[PDB]
């Protein structure tokens, strides 16, 4: 009976994680699905269980449209003179009352839809409370590994997914370690995992600097350009707003003190820390650095840039896979 | 042997027991009572009657009904002894061998 409904709403474990209002909304959906499965005809029904004053009372939704298929839920947009509508849309009736909500199939569908709704609500809640920290480095142990994606736990049943594109090709995972990344995507409507954390994207590098470099975070050394090759090489152009600070001794550190740390965090990724410049020439010279550039050709109609490197420094300006150029193109 | 003695948990607190169990229990009871009476220096006639009762119990366990008084354990029916589990059309030879 309704006493059983109150006992159910009071005997939940996650009481505030899914409050009485949304509990009774899920129960309304349960009873609506039950009444739908009762009659062979399809009819939308609202319940309004009356959380604290009274019991439930089913109704009959019309879904006012000019169609006639299954007229149990069909009524024209002009039927408003008798039965006291007086509307254009939204005209619903309260004809059928006092259905049964405790038999076998009703209990089964109720339990099923309640499980579904509570798990969905708790997943969406534990993801949404972390959504405010989008674009930050977070800790947390991984849960399970697979050939397509991995799972991470941020504490208090916080499920996060990391897809294969977010993982590095030779990134190493084992249930037990704390793989740290940056939250980048949230989809609170996803049927499954929706907390997306990445480490292959350049923004993580910024966040990496945000947890390592004290210069960044105060907007004194702005991170302007960033291109990546997972596990191979990251080309970053960071500008200096002041004059007495050199990124080769500030962003790089003291003889590879910061660049080495972010490389080990990224799993051995070469990090070319150069200076951003308002001139495309110096920008592309710093992009292919270190090298010896003796040419510059610019074309704004085709947006192309030709750099004839010196004879012999090919492996110094192109190298493996042309990364020194490809990342520059990126 | 214990499992060779029929004793199965019936429906409820009651157990389906064998007729040999009652015999062995009565034998043990009278033996313990006799051992107690021998320590308290009971009168000669009392220990005589106790020995007679223990003899009755052990011969009933051996072959009930042969002494002349077929004692019953339940349902006012003759009890099943060790000799009864061998003789007749219900012993081991006629039924289980």
């Amino acid at each position: 009976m309704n006493k059983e409904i109150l006992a159910v709403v009071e005997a939940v474990s996650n009481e505030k994680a899914l409050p009485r209002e949304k509990i009774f909304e899920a129960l309304e959906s349960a009873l609506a699905t039950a009444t739908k499965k009762k009659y062979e005809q399809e009819i939308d029904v609202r319940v309004q269980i009356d959380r604290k004053s009274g019991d439930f009372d089913t109704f009959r939704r019309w879904l006012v449209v000019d169609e006639v298929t299954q007229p149990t839920k069909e009524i024209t947009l002009e039927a408003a003179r008798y039965e006291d509508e007086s509307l254009n849309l939204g005209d619903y009736v309260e004809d059928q009352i006092e259905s049964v909500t405790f038999d076998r199939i009703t209990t089964q569908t109720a339990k099923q839809v309640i499980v579904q709704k509570v798990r969905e609500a708790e997943r969406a809640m534990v993801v949404d409370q972390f959504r405010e920290h989008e674009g930050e480095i977070i800790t947390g142990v991984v849960k399970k590994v697979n050939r397509d994606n991995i799972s991470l736990d941020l504490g208090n049943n916080a499920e996060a997914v990391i897809l294969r594109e977010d993982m590095l090709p030779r990134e190493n995972f084992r249930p037990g370690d704390r793989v740290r990344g940056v939250l980048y995507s949230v989809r609170p409507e996803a049927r499954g995992a929706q907390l997306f954390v990445t480490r292959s994207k350049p923004e993580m590098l910024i966040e990496l600097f945000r947890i390592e470099v004290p210069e960044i975070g105060e907007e004194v050394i702005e991170i302007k350009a960033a291109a990546r090759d997972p596990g191979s090489r990251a080309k970053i152009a960071v500008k200096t707003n002041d004059k007495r600070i050199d990124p080769v001794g500030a962003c790089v550190g003291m003889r590879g003190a910061r660049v080495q740390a972010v490389s080990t965090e990224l799993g051995g990724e070469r990090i070319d820390i150069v200076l951003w410049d308002d001139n495309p020439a110096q920008f592309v010279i710093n992009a292919m650095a270190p090298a010896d550039v003796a040419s510059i050709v610019v074309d704004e109609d085709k947006h192309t840039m030709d750099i004839a490197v010196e004879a012999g420094n090919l492996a110094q300006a192109i190298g493996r896979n042309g990364q020194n150029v490809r990342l520059a193109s990126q | 042997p214990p499992d060779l003695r029929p004793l199965v948990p019936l429906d409820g607190g009651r157990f389906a027991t064998s007729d040999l169990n009652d015999l062995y229990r009565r034998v043990i009871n009278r033996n313990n009572r006799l051992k107690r009476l021998l320590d308290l220096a009971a009168p000669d006639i009392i220990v005589r009657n106790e020995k007679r009762m223990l003899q009755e119990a052990v011969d009933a366990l051996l072959d009930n009904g042969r002494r002349g008084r077929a004692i019953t354990g339940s349902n006012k029916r003759p009890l099943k002894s060790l000799a009864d589990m061998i003789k007749g059309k219900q012993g081991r030879f006629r039924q289980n061998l």
């Binding site: - | 042997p1 060779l4 051996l62 060790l82 589990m85 061998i86 081991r92 030879f93 289980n96 061998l97």
Partner: protein, 48 residues
Amino acid sequence: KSDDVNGRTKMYKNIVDGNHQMEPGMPESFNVLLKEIRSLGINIELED
């Protein structure tokens, strides 16, 4: 087929494996009779 506590299982395992051959063993009820006679004041014993 009836009494061998360790023969019927062996026979079933042989038959399901396509082996139509038996093992004598010893009937359990015979050991039961041996114990029952032994429970009396009578000693029954198997020789060599």
